[PDB]
């Protein structure tokens, strides 16, 4: 149970994230309040992890999981915008983070 | 295919004109609209207000009767349409 | 251009993040009023920062490049599982070979 | 600890001028609630609140020659205990 709020945080803040994409510089309603409705509800069950679950364990998933969803949610809204070496970076970088917080 | 639209004067008053129009559907539906109103003699700047972008309607107050005003409503960027100007005697 | 405002606004989230640790509950007034404006400025640099970069690539570096900062801005002048500072190197390399 | 020194400036018939002592530079709260009724208790008290930063509030709207009971409340009661005074119009 506590293991899925954390899954309801990084899906709320992935959602919010793509809608930041549509708020045009958080110059268009109903995109612009997406993005904070998403964002609040993200945090509150985010304020429910914190108390069972530590705190590296619950953001390395998220940023694993994350890093795994917004980024499959930019080729399905519009494909590419831009393209550089590799997407290994992206791989040695989530290596990266997961060998000071885990470690 | 351009918002606003259809700029009117609904009420009027030798001090204060009340203002509307119909700007568009959800998918446009902006932040904020700023309204621009002033002399059409052109002696003079232009004052300016802003209004959320979830209201269609508009107040404006302290005017002087029997002057001809030029009121213009934009957008907050160019990219949603030419703004819309209309004229109005008290 | 797109790494400028993207780092300012790692900065202005870590800075956003660390001063709630030192207000209480929003109730001291400087710091709970700082707090607002550095996550209000981080939600506009990333919103503007976020049309050029693709969105899962502004993902890690963000988190990398934060927790960096929030490691080094630890044990800079606050407190001190620490494997080495080859996790810090690790995310600076991946960092690298994603940017210009 | 905060607030400290509460005491009446100015007092009319039918008003209390109050002060304190918000505290120091940093350590300033968000908000203080007043709260001000007879000293006696055959009817509820009123209320009301003042932004952090301001060091005075005005009470209006008092019967002359009632005494009353001003107490002032931080946000919470984790910084001291509220202050609370009397004072007779
Ligand atoms: C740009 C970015 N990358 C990773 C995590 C976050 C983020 N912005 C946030 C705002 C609130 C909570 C978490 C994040």
Redesign the interface.
């Known amino acids: 149970n506590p293991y899925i709020y954390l899954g309801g945080a990084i899906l709320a803040e992935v959602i919010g994230t793509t809608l930041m994409k549509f708020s045009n510089g958080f110059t268009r309603l109903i995109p612009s309040m997406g993005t904070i409705i998403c964002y609040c509800a993200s945090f509150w069950l985010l304020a429910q992890t914190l108390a069972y679950i530590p705190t590296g364990i619950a953001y390395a998933i998220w940023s694993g999981v994350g890093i795994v969803l917004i980024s499959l949610l930019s080729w399905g809204f519009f494909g590419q915008r831009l393209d550089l070496p590799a997407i290994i970076g992206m791989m040695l970088i989530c290596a990266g983070v997961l060998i000071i917080n885990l470690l | 295919s351009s918002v606003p639209t259809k700029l009117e004067v609904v009420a009027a008053t030798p001090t204060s004109l009340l203002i509307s129009w119909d700007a568009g559907h959800?998918?446009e539906?902006?932040?904020?609209y700023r309204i621009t109103y002033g002399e059409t003699g052109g002696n003079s700047p232009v004052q300016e207000f802003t209004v959320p972008?979830?209201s269609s309607t508009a107040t404006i107050s302290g005017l002087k009767p029997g002057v001809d005003y030029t009121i213009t409503v934009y957008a907050?960027?160019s990219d949603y349409g030419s703004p819309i100007s209309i004229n109005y005697r008290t």
């Not at chain 2, 539906?29 to 904020?32: H, I, L, S």
């Open positions: 959800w998918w539906w902006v932040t904020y972008g979830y907050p960027t």
